[PDB]
Design a protein around this nucleic acid. Structure first.
Lengths: 100, 105
DNA sequence: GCTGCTGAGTCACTGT
DNA sequence: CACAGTGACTCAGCAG
């Protein structure tokens, strides 16, 4: 007989090379087994494609989220010190004017 | 006539298939009550109900899967825009600080 | 005909 | 018990 992985690997030409002692009905049965196994591989590789898409998208979304969170937080902190420095610069505005 | 309707008919299931599937549990039980079904009839009813419900969860599951990738791809877009808006703000903050630090050495 | 794909239904689970 | 969510398999059916 034959095994599963061996059927999927070969082509239709090599499949025609293994018609030893089988009826016409066993021919289509074996051909339908290959198409079924080929279909299982198609669906599986289709799943792996979408899982890879989702994981890679999620890993690179989880990055950008932390990137903008760190950026938003640091800009908030910097704009505080930046506003405070300008406040004291503006305090020296009025004092510089008060002298003559 | 679907294969499900033929089988139910062949087993003398008096209920329409749609009512076997879509009816709520309390109403399904009410309809099922006062009925002398045998095991074969009970099994085919429950098999039609389960397959019918699960068929819709499968579509919903696949619909949500694709919809989720669209939302992730949008999520990506907005974050790349927010990063650029944030870097622009950081620049105008870095420039104002530098200009004030320059005027004071 | 074959190939690769994809929507869809079904099974066998797990979780609420 | 109920039912919903989900990976894996299956097949029909389309495009090339």
């Amino acid at each position: 007989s034959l095994t599963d992985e061996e059927l999927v690997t070969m082509s239709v030409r090599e499949l025609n090379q293994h018609l030893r002692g089988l009826s016409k009905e066993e021919i289509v049965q074996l051909k339908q087994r290959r198409r079924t196994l080929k279909n299982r591989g198609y669906a599986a590789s289709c799943r792996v494609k979408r899982v890879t898409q989702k994981e890679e998208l999620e890993k690179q979304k989880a990055e950008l989220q932390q990137e903008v969170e760190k950026l938003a937080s640091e800009n908030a902190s910097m704009k505080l010190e930046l506003d405070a420095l300008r406040s004291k610069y503006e305090a020296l505005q009025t004092f510089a004017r008060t002298v003559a | 006539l679907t294969r499900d309707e033929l089988r139910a008919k062949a087993l003398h299931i008096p209920f329409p298939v749609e009512k076997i599937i879509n009816l709520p549990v309390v109403d399904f039980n009410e309809m099922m009550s006062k009925e002398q079904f045998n095991e074969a009839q009970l099994a085919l009813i429950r098999d039609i109900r389960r397959r019918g419900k699960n068929k819709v969860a499968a579509q919903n599951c696949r619909k949500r899967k694709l919809e989720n990738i669209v939302e992730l791809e949008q999520d990506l877009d907005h974050l790349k825009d927010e990063k650029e808006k944030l870097l622009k703000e950081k620049g105008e903050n870095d420039k104002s600080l530098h200009l004030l630090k320059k005027q004071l050495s």
